[PDB]
Amino acid sequence: MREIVHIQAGQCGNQIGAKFWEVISDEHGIDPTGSYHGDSDLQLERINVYYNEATGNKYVPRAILVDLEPGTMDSVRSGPFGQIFRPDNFVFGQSGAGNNWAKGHYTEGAELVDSVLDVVRKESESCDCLQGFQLTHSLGGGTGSGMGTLLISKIREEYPDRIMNTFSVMPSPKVSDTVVEPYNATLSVHQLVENTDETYCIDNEALYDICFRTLKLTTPTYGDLNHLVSATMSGVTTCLRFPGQLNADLRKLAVNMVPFPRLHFFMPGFAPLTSRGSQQYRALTVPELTQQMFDSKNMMAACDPRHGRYLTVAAIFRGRMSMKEVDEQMLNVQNKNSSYFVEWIPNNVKTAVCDIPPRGLKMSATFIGNSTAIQELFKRISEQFTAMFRRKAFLHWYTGEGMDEMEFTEAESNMNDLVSEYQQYQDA
Amino acid sequence: MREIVHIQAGQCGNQIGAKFWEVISDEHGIDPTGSYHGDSDLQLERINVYYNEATGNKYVPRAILVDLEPGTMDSVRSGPFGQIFRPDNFVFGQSGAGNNWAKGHYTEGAELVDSVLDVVRKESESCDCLQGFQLTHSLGGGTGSGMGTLLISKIREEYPDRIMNTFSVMPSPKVSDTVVEPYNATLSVHQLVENTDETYCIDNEALYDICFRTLKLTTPTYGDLNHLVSATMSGVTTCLRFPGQLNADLRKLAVNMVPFPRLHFFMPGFAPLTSRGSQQYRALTVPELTQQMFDSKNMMAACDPRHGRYLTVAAIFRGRMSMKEVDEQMLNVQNKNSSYFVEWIPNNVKTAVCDIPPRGLKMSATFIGNSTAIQELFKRISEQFTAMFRRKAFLHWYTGEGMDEMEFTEAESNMNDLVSEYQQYQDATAD
Amino acid sequence: MRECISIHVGQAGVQIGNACWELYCLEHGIQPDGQMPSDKTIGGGDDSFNTFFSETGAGKHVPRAVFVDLEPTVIDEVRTGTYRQLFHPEQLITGKEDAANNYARGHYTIGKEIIDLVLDRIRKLADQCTGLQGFLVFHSFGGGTGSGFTSLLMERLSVDYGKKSKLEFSIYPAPQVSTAVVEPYNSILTTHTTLEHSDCAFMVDNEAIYDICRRNLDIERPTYTNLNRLISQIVSSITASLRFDGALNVDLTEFQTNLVPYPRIHFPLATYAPVISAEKAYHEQLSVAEITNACFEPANQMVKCDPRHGKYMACCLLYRGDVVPKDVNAAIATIKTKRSIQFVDWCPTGFKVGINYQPPTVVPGGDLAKVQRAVCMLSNTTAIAEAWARLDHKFDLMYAKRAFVHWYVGEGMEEGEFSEAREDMAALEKDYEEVGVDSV
Amino acid sequence: MRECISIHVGQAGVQIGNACWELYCLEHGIQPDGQMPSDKTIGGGDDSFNTFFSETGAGKHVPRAVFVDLEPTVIDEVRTGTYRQLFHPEQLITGKEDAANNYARGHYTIGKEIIDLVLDRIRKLADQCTGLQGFLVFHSFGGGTGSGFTSLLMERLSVDYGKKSKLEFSIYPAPQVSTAVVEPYNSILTTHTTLEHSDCAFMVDNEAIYDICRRNLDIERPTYTNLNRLISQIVSSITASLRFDGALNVDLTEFQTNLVPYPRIHFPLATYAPVISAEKAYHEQLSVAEITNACFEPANQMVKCDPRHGKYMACCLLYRGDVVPKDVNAAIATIKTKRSIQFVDWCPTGFKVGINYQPPTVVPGGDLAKVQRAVCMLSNTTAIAEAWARLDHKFDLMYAKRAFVHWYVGEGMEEGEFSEAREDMAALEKDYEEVGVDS
Ligand SMILES: Nc1nc2c(ncn2[C@@H]2O[C@H](COP(=O)(O)OP(=O)(O)OP(=O)(O)O)[C@@H](O)[C@H]2O)c(=O)[nH]1
Ligand SMILES: Nc1nc2c(ncn2[C@@H]2O[C@H](COP(=O)(O)OP(=O)(O)OP(=O)(O)O)[C@@H](O)[C@H]2O)c(=O)[nH]1
Ligand SMILES: Nc1nc2c(ncn2[C@@H]2O[C@H](COP(=O)(O)OP(=O)(O)O)[C@@H](O)[C@H]2O)c(=O)[nH]1
Ligand SMILES: Nc1nc2c(ncn2[C@@H]2O[C@H](COP(=O)(O)OP(=O)(O)O)[C@@H](O)[C@H]2O)c(=O)[nH]1
Ligand SMILES: COc1ccc(/N=N\c2cc(OC)c(CCBr)c(OC)c2)cc1O
Ligand SMILES: [Ca+2]
Ligand SMILES: [Ca+2]
Ligand SMILES: [Mg+2]
Ligand SMILES: [Mg+2]
Ligand SMILES: [Mg+2]
Ligand SMILES: [Mg+2]
């Protein structure tokens, strides 16, 4: 049955997670009360990947909602699709994490973590062929960053052979809540390097630039940012939700996308870039879809791919289109940018097609790249970490929760190594 | 409920003491029988500080009347507001003191110092929250000089953490009562330097001079001298009797005026001094009040403030004026006279305002200064003392009571140090 | 939920408490008898204003507040004032004899007689909280109670409540309104004694407030009533984040993480705009850009100091009323250029913004004009050390001669506690020096 | 009579096995429910098709087949398809999770747990055989199951059935259709492990079948259905000798005697002609000489190589349809002179010829047109070593940087098995060079 168990933790993780369920529910013909009201059998062929079948022919998402404060919990329970969520899958505290990784990972999160693990199991217990876990969170706060990584460590201990995949939102000074966001991010990236198999780097800096530079949105909101996120999450999970010539799962994804274990951070890309209302009166030729997908202005992570090299690429075209012209246009790209693909991994670009497009678009394209250019992201966070840590500024917010400086030193040393490893294959 | 217990001792003590109660009684709207006949609620807000409530809406002063002789006490009982006082709080003897400090401190005053104490305890115990004691006396006589300081010492033993405030009258030969007055004064100043927290120096020489020169009074009597004292006691106690903060009580005054324990002798000033002269055109303004208030001619002490420096100063204006003008004028005096203010005590001049002016004055201004120039007053006593002691004049008056010459030279050398201290801080700099 | 208890100590703390709670009521629609017709949940609820107001079964909304003073005259006015029915009597605590402008009496001689009772009352309030967040402490630096008793209370609060956060709204002494000569002494003593027990302190320089009331409000001779009405506006702006909700409203605890880079460096500088009289407000409306620029005028600051002679480590802008983000962004952009905002090299040069949508209120008969939008800027700048230097220097002038020191030693204190307090002040001044130095 | 059991492993093996068994039925007259009106001995017999079909008392004809996949979505198709009635539930073995395109996972992790079950289900089939000849194993090179599990199966089959023949039908990986980046890894690993356990292996390169489908059938984007329906035509031509009366390649041992003189060099090239689009309503009927000559055209080979630049070791010609010998001899006489056919000196230069009078059957609704004569040429030429060279080079590019190796080491396989397989591959390449290279 290849079931997937979804977890969303913290404010960011629960707002992007709720948008994800609202988007793919629509695509699978489910309504806010969990009853199927669609027209295609393709919508239900792999519905059990993300949904449990309720007693009375309704579908409930295999999702667990986690937070250290009830604020965002209630915003979801009051949203459009808030009623489709199993009421017993809401685990929350009252104290909050104060944008503090330490509180989320060591002190406040320490007491909620079993309540969360109790639901994961109940939910995994009901899985016929559990495939792995999928987690949504930001890295710049405390609950999703600190507790989120604590859950990953907890879950891997009990399911050491299931696949662990995360949608992780990187912080950026252009959309910042607090100044300690680099501290929170660096400590989390060290966890992710060790404890997950696949991480989608969703960069708030990139999301901001797309909204302000391309979409012409003067004062972008998290709703605008999150519209890009859900479109990306829809596309990047298309191969798991619908049947195709390639019946993909998380493990097959990992075995073909990650050549070296630590290098498991992917750049997502999406085309066409649309806005809230949008309009889409002119459809896009596959040549346009393909050329947009690979431009830096369509990257969901602020990295210039030309500054690096693609180790492995994975692309999906959605809608009624000539699979021949998709093949032609994709092979024309590899030849137009041959020097941005490593030559020691033959045939490292794989493309798939699915005739079911997302809501409000005649055709689209999504793309994951395992590219050495991702090193620019980690470098940017590293430089901001160091400017503060050099003077031990704001450290008292963490040492007052039992943390030592050595932990920070350790965390950054491991992230500079990761930058080095990426640099090592840029010159091959 | 910040009660003060008032004590009057001796002729001067009861004289100026009687006029004090006359004046503040008229300000708070209390008649000679103790009924309230005023018009403003501000008169009864702090009435408890100086008056007890008596069953039936009577207001009795919290005063104790004391003297080694019945003369003055019969008279205070027959003047205005004589019936206001509690007849129990009259404590008089009969042997008298003969203007001899030794008799009031060791022998005669001793026989009577217990009776006075029982009345103090009775009044003190009846206080919601006792504040301190204020004593009106003289330093030249025998009773208020000798036994007044004996009382201060006895009260301090039982109330060691309360405030001890005195209105001490200095002797001047222009109003001379007796020749031995420099002895009594020195022996008293030695007690006041050690056993009181704050002493107002009401100087008979300064009072006589105001009446002669300014008020143009050829034959100034004790009644004329005392109208000046009563005007001073009225203003110097204004911030204790009416709503408002800043020196609202005796301890806050002590903390803000006494930078070193021994230097607790204040120079009072008053304006307008022309209480009943013959030059009209007064047209008193905030600027003129400030100017006059800091002039040697307006000081109830024979010292020129420009011969020393102010450690601290407290000024209170009464009447209807613009606060901003007072502020500006008070600033203009400090700036224009900066050389006469120690630089090491920052913001050492505080100003208070009260809406209620004194009886018969559109506006007045009272001044309390802690100035090193006061050593002029102590120097005058010392050299008059030394003129007698050098020749051992009249010592038998005191040795016959048991005193020894060491007691004289002790008080002598102590007051020499007091002058030395004031000079030390006059020359101290901030760099 | 996440309740804050407020504690008002001494005259200044009590009278500022008056101004604040009167304003809170007019901002939430609470009447002087504690009834809130808009509140549809009787006896309780988890509304944002419940962080500061509890609820009885009769629908009364009672401030989570304790007033304390070592003498009754000031609290007696609350007990018989317009809002006498808002508080239970047990919330108003008074002694019979105050500190006499003496730290020693506030911390020991007199204060020790009433401390237990004050803590017992605070406990009562705390037991009614589902998630106590911390305490707000209002006091003066210069008074005997405001310094001495506050320090004693601060120390006891750390014992009974551990690391639960304590914020200070302190009054810094100014000569135009000072009531005691020894106020520098009391100031340094309480500052040294509370530094390690306080997570954040908002200093209000009485001279800054006095001069603003004079220039901006056209008040010839400001009184405590004038100063206090304007202070409560600053306090209302800072606490509004916890008493209101909104899509763009940011919690003060979030700013707290940005405002305090090291434990001892927890003194933010507050600016408020617009401070305008009705006679002048009528005519000119004030845009977001206009009020934002006013926040970088030295003349509008709560503490006298020149921020262009220092370096910023944090800048928070707390807008309130008719304000949309597009305007704020435009304003900062221009400010960033026409101004000299210099940040230390170890922290990002950004402006943290929060926008409450509940517009500002004015007490009837106040001197401030009613405006459609306002802003309070909270910034951590090394420039505030100037206020430390000035206060420290007045201390040095007196202590060199040991002036007035006998009033403290006579109460039990030792000279060593003066040099100790001063040594601390000296380190604090060096601490501000060091955070501003550039990195290697 | 001697029996053959077919084993289908992985997705490619199962889906190709489906296409073949469907074809077998259309060719022999077996209906989708197992009935055979042509067959007159009910529930018994010793006819030539009994080598692939057993009989029940009720007249049902059952394929001697076994389908094994580590995941059920592909075998469920067989279990609910058109010929579902043809198979017994025990003939379909499905697992829980697949090999994840990981040879290691297929051979070591999932393999250790399913091997015994599969061997038992085969034992049941064998027990029903009076004189089993051996096995035909269908699988892909690149799949984790097709490569990882298959090699372990071949290892055990050699133990359980020593004197039996093992024949292979292997799908060689092509990027146009490949699904994983590590398929070169899986190809080298399984080739090294099966080499000693396979007697003869027919490689089909998906690149060749793909282009034949676009060039000759006019299919823009060929899918597995197109690809597979053509592969089963070749497979059917190869196995027709076992299911029909004849004298050439009548048992799995002749396939080696006639095509494999060196054991290690057991990869014959398959060429097939004519491939004609069923959308061509009118087409000229190619002659024996014309279709025979097309056998030496590169475009028609199952693997894209150049036989002109190699040597021959054995050439088999298998015609189906209207072919009299006289025409074949005439065709061979010409192709000798014109074309460049050079045999190894240690071998006779000639051709073994087999003619089956029944012409090729085409699945109705398929892509291929009905023809009156077709030919499959099986030739053991050193030219096929080109495919080993390209595959070995792709292996070398990745293994040089140790890319993706951690996936295999994490299943318990040790890294040294990689170079041990590569060392074997390098030996194979040199074996080909020596058999047919000159100064
Ligand atoms: N802004 C402001 N400052 C005040 C107020 N009341 C007093 N102050 C200032 O506070 C200082 C004196 O402290 P207070 O609060 O009066 O004294 P306290 O804390 O009651 O202390 P004690 O009277 O000695 O027991 C001086 O600097 C005054 O100017 C007020 O209502 N507002
Ligand atoms: N000709 C042909 N090739 C196929 C078919 N299915 C898969 N392939 C090819 O075989 C390789 C993948 O092997 P599969 O059979 O899909 O894999 P598997 O044996 O199921 O292995 P796992 O999925 O890893 O358990 C790729 O080169 C595919 O292109 C098919 O039906 N026909
Ligand atoms: N894209 C996006 N980023 C968000 C969102 N909410 C918060 N963030 C970012 O996440 C970080 C703060 O983490 P948050 O989820 O608020 O904290 P937590 O509740 O402690 O996990 C900052 O970098 C924010 O900019 C959101 O809805 N969308
Ligand atoms: N101003 C003033 N001084 C007085 C008065 N009566 C006495 N003195 C002074 O008091 C001193 C003598 O003390 P006195 O009170 O007569 O004697 P005692 O009763 O023994 O203390 C002399 O310097 C007198 O001038 C009076 O009514 N007013
Ligand atoms: C090495 O290159 C590969 C990457 C992956 C993959 N495995 N199958 C996939 C492929 C997908 O990308 C194209 C997706 C949709 C992402 Br737009 C997928 O679900 C996430 C699984 C197989 C590969 O050969
Ligand atoms: Ca309520
Ligand atoms: Ca038969
Ligand atoms: Mg947040
Ligand atoms: Mg006499
Ligand atoms: Mg007070
Ligand atoms: Mg499979």
Numbering used by the authors:
A (entry chain B): 1 to 42, 45 to 360, 369 to 438
B (entry chain D): 1 to 42, 45 to 360, 369 to 441
C (entry chain C): 1 to 440
D (entry chain A): 1 to 439
Quote the study that presented this structure, word for word.
Here, we describe a multi-reservoir, high viscosity extruder as a step towards automation of sample delivery at XFELs. After commissioning the device with lysozyme crystals, we collected time-resolved data using crystals of a membrane-bound, light-driven sodium pump. Static data were also collected from the soluble protein tubulin that was soaked with a series of small molecule drugs. In two commissioning beamtimes at the SwissFEL Alvra endstation, we validated the general performance of the multi-reservoir extruder and determined 13 structures overall.
Here, we exploited serial crystallography data and associated data processing methods to identify a low occupancy ligand at room temperature. We acquired data of tubulin soaked with a structurally unexploded photochemical ligand SolQ2Br, which is expected to bind the colchicine site. Here, we used the T2R-TTL crystal system where there are two possible colchicine binding pockets available since the crystal system is formed of two copies of tubulin. Notably, the two sites can exhibit different ligand-occupancy levels and we thus refer to these as sites 1 and 2. We noted that for site 1, the standard omit map does not account for the apo structure revealing ligand binding and the refined electron density revealed the ligand binding pose. However, for site 2 the signal level of the positive difference density was not significant enough to confirm ligand binding. The increased sensitivity of these difference maps allowed observing ligand binding not only in site 1, but also in site 2. Furthermore, we extrapolated the structure factors of the ligand bound state to full occupancy using the software Xtrapol848. Consequently, we could model the binding pose and infer the occupancy level for site 2 as 25–30%.
